Every structure is written in C-alpha cells, then in structure tokens.
Design a protein around this ligand. Structure first.
Ligand SMILES: C[C@H]1O[C@H](O[C@H]2[C@H](O)[C@@H](O)[C@@H](O[C@@H]3C(CO)=C[C@H](N[C@H]4[C@H](O)[C@@H](O)[C@@H](O[C@H]5[C@H](O)[C@@H](O)[C@@H](O)O[C@@H]5CO)O[C@@H]4C)[C@H](O)[C@H]3O)O[C@@H]2CO)[C@H](O)[C@@H](O)[C@@H]1N
Ligand SMILES: [Ca+2]
Ligand SMILES: [Cl-]
Length: 496
C-alpha cells in the first residue's frame, strides 16, 4: 500500500479538484503524460446529496447518498473512459474515498442527489446501497448530542458523528463488504489507489478489515501482485491522543505539519528563515519520509477549512507559493502532491471568508469545461497551477533527480540557500531583502544549462536564463530580491 504504482520515473500526483472526467482524460493525453506527471487525484466519484442552500457547495461531494458512479464530474461511462485513456498514456488515477459516513443527519428526505436516488437521513434509509438504521453508529456513540464534542476523547472521535454526518458502523462485516464492493469496482476499472478521507474518524483496525477485502490492481496495466496505493487523511499537528503513526499499517499518511511550517518559513514569520531548512524532514519532527504524503496546500486549507492556519500558501499568494512548491519538489522528503484549483468570490467578514463554500465554475450548477488559452493557461476561472511553467518544470526536476542524495548545501545564515541532488540537479533560492550574487559548487558536469524556472530548453537553445558550469562544477548565480521568481533550478535534462 506504500508504493505509488506510477510509471518508472514519474514522482508526483496532481489534485484536479472538481474537474469533469472528460476534461481529465484530455488533460492526460495532451499535457500530463508528455510533461511527466505521475497521476491524478480525483474528487469523490460516488453519488452525493445535491445541496441547494448554499448553492452547490464544493463540500456536497463529501455527503454520499450511494456508491453509484454519477456526480457533477460525469457518469460511470465517462469515469471508465477517463481511467482507460489515462492508464493508456502512463498517467494513474487516485480516488478520494468517502467511507466514514453518509450524508448530514438533518438533510431532508427525497431524491435531491446527483443521480436521483431516494434517501431518508431521518430514518437512516439509503436503499440504493442498501443501508438501514442497523448500519450506523447511533447506538455506540456516548455523547449527549450524538456528535463529536471533544477531540481529547479518541473513542468519540471514531464512534460519533463528524459535524452531524451519519457515522457508518465500520465495525460490522456487512458495512465493510458494501464499502469493499465499491472500492473493488474502482480497482477493476483501473484505479491505482485511494485517498482515504476522514481517516482519523475510523479505527485503524476497521480500515484494515476493509483493505483486506481489496483486489490486486488491474493486470492489463499493473504487474501481477500490485496493491492499491493508500494515503490516509489524518490531521495530526500534535497535542491530541490520535497520532498519524497509528495509521502506518494501512499506507501513507498526509503530513499536515509540512505545509504549515513551510508557509511560516517562506513568509519569514515567527522568526523563521530558509537557512533553518538545512535539516528539513524528520529533523523538524515530521513522520518518516517513506510514510509521508506532502503538499503545500490542499482543497480544505486553501479556503480555511480543516486545520486552516494563517501561514498556508496558495495560488492567491502566487510568488511565495511558487517558491514553496519549488522547494518541496527539489527536496527528497516525502511523496509529493501538487494542487490544482479554481477561483471563487473571496469575501472576508470579521476575518473569515463567507464564500468558502463556493463550488467549481458553473452555469446554474453545471460544471464549466476547462478551456485552454493560447498561452497554455486555462480559462473559465480554472487556475491550473499544474500548467504554470515554474511548477510544471519543477515536477520534471523531481523526476530527473529521483534517488539522488541531498548535497552541496549553502546558506548565508538568513534566507539565501542552495542545494544539489547528487550530480543531477541544483537549486538556488533568494528570500532575503538584498541581491544574492555568488559563485557556488553545483555538483553538476561542465556545460551550459537552461534555468527551468525562467524558461525552457528547445532546439539547442534556452528561452530564459542560462547558467555556465565550469570544469570544477562551479557556477555564478545572480538573483535580485526584486525578482518576480527569486529562485533558479538546473538539472541534467536542461543542459545544452
Ligand atoms: C453536515 C455538515 O456539512 C458541511 O460540512 C462540510 C465541511 O465543512 C467540509 O470541510 C467537508 O469536510 C470534508 C470531510 C468530511 O467528509 C473530511 C475532511 N477533512 C476534515 C478532517 O477529516 C476532520 O478531522 C476535521 O478536522 C479537524 C481536525 O481533525 C482537528 O484536529 C482540528 O484541527 O479541527 C479540524 C477542523 O474540525 O474536519 C476536516 C475538514 C475532508 O477533506 C473535508 O473536505 O465536507 C463537510 C460535509 O459536507 C457544513 O460545512 C457543516 O456545517 C455541516 N454540519
Ligand atoms: Ca466514524
Ligand atoms: Cl488531503
């Protein structure tokens, strides 16, 4: 469950948050494959509650009504077509699996769901599964409200209702079997693994019992005996009884300390600075590298949900965000996930965004297609971070340096730092208020290299900055603090 199952030499996944299946399939073919992306995390593919107040929020997708593959992203046929077309070009698909709970206990009964299935939360009736009152934890929870009241009590965190969401009885074999049926349907289609949503709210032993029922990956694309890649969402920032390490038996775990601390460093908040990143990783108290799923922001914390945190960097602070993402992709710690977002009407009212619920770009609830502008950016209000040159070219940097040791570290005692990955790549950052200009040891063979942050290599020339590495591996770097991108990266495949 720890191996990504990506094609050899592809090292990252991109979260195409709320994108339609037909758009993802085209994106695999035209962009992700030739650019070396390993895989795509998709939003929940299972039928959910259509919530009309507020209007079609992104979060309605975390309120399941059935395991039918019918959502605003498209139907079962479109889902199958996407997975096929992606695997056929060597790009994997990872599913966001919502298995802790069904919908909110106070949603009205009826057929207001993305596939028209009837459901009755009040009587616990979900006949398209089917589930009944017998399949929920109402009798097991011991709080007055039936909802989670206290994160200091590990038992109620697992047995009671997260924010009123109907809590599935994952202790019983019937429920475990219905969930396993859904996941096996996905695996046979050609899915390479799963983000397990709300993992903190399930017993690690109940997750195990469901994963024991899973098939091996589809033998047309994957070697015999391949297991789905599993990464679990657990928010463990310290100081509560549940620990991310309680989940290592099942797969990888999301390391939320990563993006909170890196955002603080890059913003230079709290007395922190880039020279302290010399021991980034386990030195900062993070979980082991071989268990971590890392990221700068995710779909929750980029809009103040989940753990939130003011330090989080997102597309909305583009200049610092590209640097943070650039550091993450150059550094060997963890398995990396890049976010891909949409814009929404951000409106603050006593220091909270009251529009944090807004769903993807839409026409009366119908998801807008991803259009591609002539300069290769996206229209219709999709951000497409994954197509920003500085991010895409760092996704390739990580592939080119895969397996190479962290070496040749330099720092000025403040916010000018540089490091190498073996003899395959070198990266230089200026986050200080003055120019960085210095001759440094790169570890690279002699030659002319294109800086892949400012430009691209094409036809034996560069479109941006060029760096000249001499016979002893040294090169001069000059980065103004006023630079729009104040970092430089070169690697073995950017050499002329
Ligand atoms: C009925 C309910 O509907 C709406 O709730 C929505 C939320 O606002 C959305 O954020 C979204 O939640 C998703 C989800 C549930 O499917 C789980 C994910 N993330 C969770 C995390 O798993 C939880 O543990 C919890 O995090 C807490 C930490 O564990 C604590 O340590 C501490 O830091 O507090 C945090 C915050 O409580 O909540 C996280 C968000 C998943 O990725 C989420 O996207 O969807 C739900 C369901 O629609 C309404 O917003 C709400 O008011 C209604 N009561
Ligand atoms: Ca639970
Ligand atoms: Cl996540």
């Amino acid at each position: 469950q720890y191996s990504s199952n990506t094609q050899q030499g592809r090292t990252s996944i991109v979260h195409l948050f709320e994108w339609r299946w037909v758009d993802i399939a085209l994106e695999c073919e035209r962009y992700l494959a030739p650019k070396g992306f390993g895989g795509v995390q998709v939003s929940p593919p299972n039928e959910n509650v259509a919530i009309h107040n507020p209007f079609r929020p992104w979060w309605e997708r975390y309120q399941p009504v059935s395991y039918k593959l019918c959502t605003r992203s498209g139907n079962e046929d479109e889902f199958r077509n996407m997975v096929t077309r992606c695997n056929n070009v060597g790009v994997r698909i990872y599913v966001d699996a919502v298995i802790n709970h069904m919908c909110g206990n106070a949603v009205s009964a009826g057929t207001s769901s993305t596939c028209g299935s009837y459901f009755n939360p009040g009587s616990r009736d979900f006949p398209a599964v089917p589930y009944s009152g017998w399949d929920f934890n109402d009798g097991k929870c011991k709080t007055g409200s039936g909802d989670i009241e206290n994160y200091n009590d590990a038992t109620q965190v697992r047995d009671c209702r997260l924010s009123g969401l109907l809590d599935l009885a994952l202790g019983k074999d019937y429920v475990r079997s219905k969930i396993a049926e859904y996941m096996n349907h996905l695996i046979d289609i050609g899915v390479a693994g799963f983000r397990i949503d709300a993992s903190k709210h399930m017993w690690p032993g109940d997750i195990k019992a469901i994963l024991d029922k899973l098939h091996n990956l589809n033998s047309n694309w994957f070697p015999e005996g391949s297991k789905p890649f599993i990464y679990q969402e657990v928010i463990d920032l310290g100081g509560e009884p549940i620990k991310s390490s309680d989940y290592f038996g099942n797969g990888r775990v999301t390391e939320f300390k990563y993006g909170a601390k890196l955002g603080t460093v890059i913003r230079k908040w709290n007395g922190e600075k880039m020279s302290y990143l010399k021991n980034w990783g386990e030195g900062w108290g993070f979980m082991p590298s071989d268990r971590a799923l890392v990221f700068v922001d995710n779909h929750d914390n980029q809009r103040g949900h989940g753990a939130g945190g003011a330090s989080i960097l997102t597309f909305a602070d583009a200049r610092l965000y590209k640097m943070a993402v650039g550091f993450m992709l150059a550094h060997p710690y963890g398995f990396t996930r890049v976010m891909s977002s949409y814009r929404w009407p951000r409106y603050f009212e006593n220091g909270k965004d009251v529009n944090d619920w807004v769903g993807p770009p839409n026409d009366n609830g119908v998801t807008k297609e991803v259009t591609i502008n002539p300069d290769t950016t996206c229209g219709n209000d999709w951000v497409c971070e994954h197509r920003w040159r500085q991010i895409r070219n760092m996704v390739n940097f990580r592939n080119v340096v895969d397996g190479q040791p962290f070496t040749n570290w330099y720092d000025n005692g403040s916010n000018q730092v540089a490091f190498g990955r073996g003899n395959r790549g070198f990266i230089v950052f200026n986050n200080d208020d003055w120019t960085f200009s210095l001759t440094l040891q790169t570890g690279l063979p002699a030659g002319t290299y294109c800086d892949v942050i400012s430009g691209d290599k094409i036809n034996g020339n560069c479109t941006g900055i060029k760096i000249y590495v001499s016979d002893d591996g040294k090169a001069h770097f000059s980065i103004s603090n006023s630079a729009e991108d104040p970092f430089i990266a070169i690697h073995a495949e950017s050499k002329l």
